[PDB]
């Protein structure tokens, strides 16, 4: 028995990452094995770790954690440095609108576990971690139970499948900070310290956990590894057809008729995600904006963009927060502002004060209590959160809000 989980709707056109995760229940190792699970692990253990990195590199799999870094290339970087090496699965997923990772964790943990084992073997890591956010307690317990199932079947522990390879997966819990999703802050949290990002360079692939070469990969990125090895790198790049390979999970939320997680190829357009898959909008109202999590804002004139990592593509984590006619852009920008105010770790001054002033000035703007100075200050603050920032939060904390000021000036003008 596990704690209560919300019944997140999940749908797929590819039947890969959501082959079992499309059903809202914990799939045991027996159900995973019945579907041909752990066959990729068996195949991978008969290959050299180098061959596996090459297949992952050749597959063209890119990180699913926002940054879109080629996974194969990242692994190649870590193996160029002596061991011991560490593999970390990033299950921190705390960006607003993002809920794609938990449905893999809670429904098909063995898909993730196998991916972790193959990836750890590929980089020579004998010690792996799953850093799961504290607000996913059920996911935590599900993963612990699934790790015990894997050991009992010989997929984890000592001399895995008679290959001689030893692996331990430790499940760590976060405790309420979005910043712990940032790969260096995550490592600090794992070392038992406050989730304060460290200045880069050094990079985790050379100096990570205990200053050792560490590979941090997102849950969804890891879930793609069993498919790459099972199908082969070739089959994997052919699925789309798009220049950005593999299945992709799209957490769709907001004023859509059917919010949920949609497994679609990245050639799918933003309009298709909303109208063809999510079932359009409530009352068939016009989509005014789409927030790519708390990162970007797309207007109704940008609906025909692809959901890939191309320069004109959707990008990010494929997070779709739909805003209709009835939704106030300033009120929305305030919720984004409030999110960065609450999540800045406070290490960098322009980020610490910038995120705070952006939210506080936006609240005054929204409440009709802002002076001409509060307006002029809001513009200044929004443009000056980035300076001296040592992590990605500071660089993007004003990005979405700047996009609304640029794409929806009529809406802001009402308040001015």
């Amino acid at each position: 028995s596990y704690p209560a989980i919300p019944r997140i709707y999940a749908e797929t056109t590819l039947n890969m990452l959501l082959k079992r995760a499309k059903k809202p229940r914990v799939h045991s190792i027996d159900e995973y094995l019945k579907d041909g699970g752990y066959q990729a692990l068996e195949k991978a253990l008969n290959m050299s770790p180098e061959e596996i990195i090459d297949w992952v590199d050749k597959s063209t799999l890119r990180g699913r954690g926002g940054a879109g870094f080629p996974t194969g290339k990242k692994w190649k970087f870590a193996v160029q440095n002596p061991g011991p090496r560490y593999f970390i699965c990033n299950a921190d997923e705390s960006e607003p609108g993002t809920f794609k990772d938990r449905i893999i964790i809670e429904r098909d943990p063995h898909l993730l576990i196998e991916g972790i084992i193959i990836s750890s073997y590929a980089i020579g890591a004998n010690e792996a971690y799953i850093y799961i956010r504290g607000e996913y307690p059920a996911g935590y317990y599900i993963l612990r139970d699934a790790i015990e199932e894997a050991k009992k079947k010989g997929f984890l522990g000592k001399n895995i499948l008679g290959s001689g390879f030893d692996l331990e997966i430790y499940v760590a819990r976060g405790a309420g900070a979005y910043i712990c999703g940032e790969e260096t802050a995550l490592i600090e949290s794992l070392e038992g310290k406050r989730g304060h990002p460290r200045l880069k360079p050094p990079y985790p692939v050379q100096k990570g956990l205990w200053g050792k070469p560490t590979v941090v990969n997102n849950v969804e990125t890891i879930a793609n590894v069993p498919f790459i090895i099972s199908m082969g790198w070739e089959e994997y790049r052919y699925i789309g057809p798009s220049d950005y390979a593999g299945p992709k999970l799209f957490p769709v939320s907001g004023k859509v008729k059917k919010p949920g997680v949609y497994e679609l190829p990245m050639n799918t357009t933003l309009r298709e995600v909303i109208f063809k898959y999510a079932g359009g909008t409530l009352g068939n109202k016009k989509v005014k904006a789409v927030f790519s999590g708390a990162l970007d804002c797309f207007s109704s004139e940008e609906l025909d963009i692809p959901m890939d990592y191309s320069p004109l593509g959707f990008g990010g984590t494929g997070t779709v927060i739909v805003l209709t006619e009835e939704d106030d852009i300033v009120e929305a920008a305030l919720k984004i502002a409030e999110f960065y105010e609450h999540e800045t770790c406070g290490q960098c001054t322009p980020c610490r004060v910038g995120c705070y002033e952006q939210a506080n000035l936006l609240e005054k703007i929204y409440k009709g209590e802002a002076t001409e100075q509060d307006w002029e200050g809001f513009d200044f603050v929004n443009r000056n959160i980035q300076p001296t920032s040592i992590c990605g939060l500071g660089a993007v904390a004003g990005r979405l809000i700047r996009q609304t000021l640029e794409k929806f000036p009529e809406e802001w003008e009402k308040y001015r």
Binding site: A4, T98, G134, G176, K193, R194, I336, F339, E343
Partner: protein, 155 residues
């Protein structure tokens, strides 16, 4: 201060779980809050010595992580998401209903110390907005009726 056998055993399990003792801090602090309904300030010293860390290191951790509450004691923590999707889908309706049922606002604890409304950022269940947690349990808010029914499972 003395930790009970039941909690000490669980704390020790966490400490021996990871390769290094200090890595178990968050899991130990989650377990302390689960037992007491808060992080008692007196419990920070025996925990510090259990991980082989300075007391100020542990204090810094409790203060940094949002889920750990060093001030208020509550048997059940109602974490109500105040982020964009839940706000757009009905955070204030859920907050109104909780106020009508419990007679408390966010950051307040019921006089009997049973429930505490905790405003939190995105719970990662945005398709099910408005979202709320009652300790480890997570639900979608539908109405005051549906809420009163859910909240009656907690005694």
């Amino acid at each position: 201060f003395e930790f009970p056998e039941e909690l000490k055993t669980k704390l020790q399990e966490h400490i021996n779980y990871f390769p290094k003792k200090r890595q178990a801090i968050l899991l130990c602090l989650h377990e302390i809050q689960n037992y007491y309904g808060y992080i008692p300030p007196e419990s920070l010293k025996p925990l510090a010595d259990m991980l082989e860390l300075p007391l100020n290191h542990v204090e810094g951790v409790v203060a940094f992580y949002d889920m750990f509450d060093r001030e208020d004691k509550a048997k059940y923590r109602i974490r109500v998401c105040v982020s964009i999707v839940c706000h757009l889908m009905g955070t204030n309706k859920l907050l109104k209903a909780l106020e009508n049922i419990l007679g408390i606002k966010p950051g307040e604890v019921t006089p009997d110390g049973k429930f505490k409304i905790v405003p939190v950022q995105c719970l990662g269940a945005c398709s099910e907005a408005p979202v709320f947690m009652v300790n480890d349990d997570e639900y979608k808010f539908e109405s005051e009726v549906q809420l009163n029914e859910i909240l009656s499972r907690y005694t």
